[PDB]
Design an enzyme around this catalytic site. Sequence first.
Site, PDB file in Angstrom:
ATOM      1  N   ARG A   8     -59.206-172.784   6.362  1.00  0.00           N
ATOM      2  CA  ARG A   8     -57.833-173.178   6.107  1.00  0.00           C
ATOM      3  C   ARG A   8     -57.685-174.681   6.128  1.00  0.00           C
ATOM      4  O   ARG A   8     -58.331-175.414   6.553  1.00  0.00           O
ATOM      5  CB  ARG A   8     -56.948-172.566   7.372  1.00  0.00           C
ATOM      6  CG  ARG A   8     -55.392-172.196   7.327  1.00  0.00           C
ATOM      7  CD  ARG A   8     -54.426-173.341   7.094  1.00  0.00           C
ATOM      8  NE  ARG A   8     -53.222-172.869   7.716  1.00  0.00           N
ATOM      9  CZ  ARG A   8     -52.467-173.444   8.039  1.00  0.00           C
ATOM     10  NH1 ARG A   8     -52.725-174.840   8.352  1.00  0.00           N
ATOM     11  NH2 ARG A   8     -51.130-172.957   8.394  1.00  0.00           N
ATOM     12  N   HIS A   9     -56.723-175.063   5.116  1.00  0.00           N
ATOM     13  CA  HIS A   9     -56.334-176.380   5.026  1.00  0.00           C
ATOM     14  C   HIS A   9     -55.686-176.917   6.187  1.00  0.00           C
ATOM     15  O   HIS A   9     -55.293-176.665   7.096  1.00  0.00           O
ATOM     16  CB  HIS A   9     -55.166-176.610   3.693  1.00  0.00           C
ATOM     17  CG  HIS A   9     -53.924-175.757   4.268  1.00  0.00           C
ATOM     18  ND1 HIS A   9     -52.955-176.115   4.998  1.00  0.00           N
ATOM     19  CD2 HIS A   9     -53.367-174.507   3.858  1.00  0.00           C
ATOM     20  CE1 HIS A   9     -52.006-175.331   5.129  1.00  0.00           C
ATOM     21  NE2 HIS A   9     -52.324-174.300   4.221  1.00  0.00           N
ATOM     22  N   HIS A 194     -55.916-170.985   2.317  1.00  0.00           N
ATOM     23  CA  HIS A 194     -54.788-170.802   3.046  1.00  0.00           C
ATOM     24  C   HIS A 194     -55.202-169.738   4.437  1.00  0.00           C
ATOM     25  O   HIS A 194     -56.136-169.131   4.132  1.00  0.00           O
ATOM     26  CB  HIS A 194     -53.747-170.019   2.185  1.00  0.00           C
ATOM     27  CG  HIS A 194     -53.349-171.038   1.183  1.00  0.00           C
ATOM     28  ND1 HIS A 194     -52.398-171.844   1.080  1.00  0.00           N
ATOM     29  CD2 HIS A 194     -53.935-171.224  -0.155  1.00  0.00           C
ATOM     30  CE1 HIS A 194     -52.576-172.414  -0.186  1.00  0.00           C
ATOM     31  NE2 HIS A 194     -53.317-171.917  -0.958  1.00  0.00           N
TER      32      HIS A 194
END
Lengths: 263, 273
Positions: A8-9, A194
């Site tokens: 995840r960013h 994401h």
Amino acid sequence: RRGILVIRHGERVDQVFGKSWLQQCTTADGKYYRPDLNFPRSLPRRSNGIKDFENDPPLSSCGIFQARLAGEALLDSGVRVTAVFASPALRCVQTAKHILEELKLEKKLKIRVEPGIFEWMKWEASKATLTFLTLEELKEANFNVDLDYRPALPRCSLMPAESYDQYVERCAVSMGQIINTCPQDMGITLIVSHSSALDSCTRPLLGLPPRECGDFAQLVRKIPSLGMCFCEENREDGKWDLVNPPVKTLTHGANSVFNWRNW
Amino acid sequence: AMGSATISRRGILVIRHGERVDQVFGKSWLQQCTTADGKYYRPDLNFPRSLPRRSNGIKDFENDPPLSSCGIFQARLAGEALLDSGVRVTAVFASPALRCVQTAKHILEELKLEKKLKIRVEPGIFEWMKWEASKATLTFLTLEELKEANFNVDLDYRPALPRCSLMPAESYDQYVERCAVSMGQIINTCPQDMGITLIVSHSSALDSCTRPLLGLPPRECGDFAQLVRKIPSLGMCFCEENREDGKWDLVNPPVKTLTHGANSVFNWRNWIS
């Protein structure tokens, strides 16, 4: 054993400062300034306009820290990183770049930008007007992007109106291509994307059918920044297995706004 | 440049240490990161890469915890902003607590001043003893241990209050008095100086190290406790001196606040079960 690490960013500037963040750091003439240290020291040039940052925001300073901390951990772990793919969202490309920098692989490995692993369009409030940085814009901003990568899904083919079924399918198609985007290379492939991707980009590998939309939505809702899930290939048995990631989790507290004048 | 409103002003910038590992991981943090054979390891990436070489091994960190990885990030981000601001930093004093000396080092490294300025360890700006373990002072890293650990500490510095002079039973009145006395000595260290001195300390110090400069009486204890509860990591209070009258005023700090969110613990395999 070959591995796929979905990451995840890091923290987005708008998560902390809200939807009006751009107004908070720009003049009427659109000069950038940093009203809080968690705003980044600069913004990349967006030749479609600064206003495109609203739909496609950068990492906060803390998000950059998280990404770099994860890269340093990956370096310390001794795993061999062999390729990296990123969602075209700025936050994802930036997360990939900062991981690579601390792995000291940013010159050696090019970021492969894959719109097929972008967020579910339903969840992008911006969807109708959403514009990513082009590869050339990314290169101009010192991202070492793979100008020669042919994506599983070109960005013109992402549908604002995509349904859950269409979303999970395109992730499976995308992952199917990515897993063939390397004959035999021993090591790990980073998938920088994401929260949704921790489910949608692993279940296809694990030969699992998609989750019911509501269940998926609930599971994916509270994945933290730099959250990871790791899958390893068992090629003899013709399967992939969900396995503990090669680095520990990251837990830290918040830092609250502070006005000295309040005493 | 020599006009009354243009002459540069001496500054004192009181800065709270970065996030401490035990704020996140709780009172059991040390047992979390100690292997069965007694060695340090990182069970979460917010534990730092290493601990300083210490007397009595790993066990002395019990009451003197290090910055977390996030605290190090906060300290470095502040130091970088200080560099960006162009201000002249001329001296740095730190509380003997590890978290404070570490915060000081990281700020100086980002200022590019870590070899130019030595950290002056001042126990007179340590936390109020009421809020620390009684044996806390017996367990600070020595200056030699800090230099071993690559802290450019001042071996010549003669603190206003020696560490063994810290009293476990000091009252609030005694606490505010020793902070006043220490700040008095700090100001007279080089009274002609025209840049900024950093005071890298505890949330309490943003009140107790500034009120004496401003010529204000101590806040009522309850009022003080409520106030200092509120100060974030790297929170700052800035005072500047008018050289004409020697009076100090509270001024906007030369760098902005830092506001960010938490990051929750996470295990996907566990999460989906």
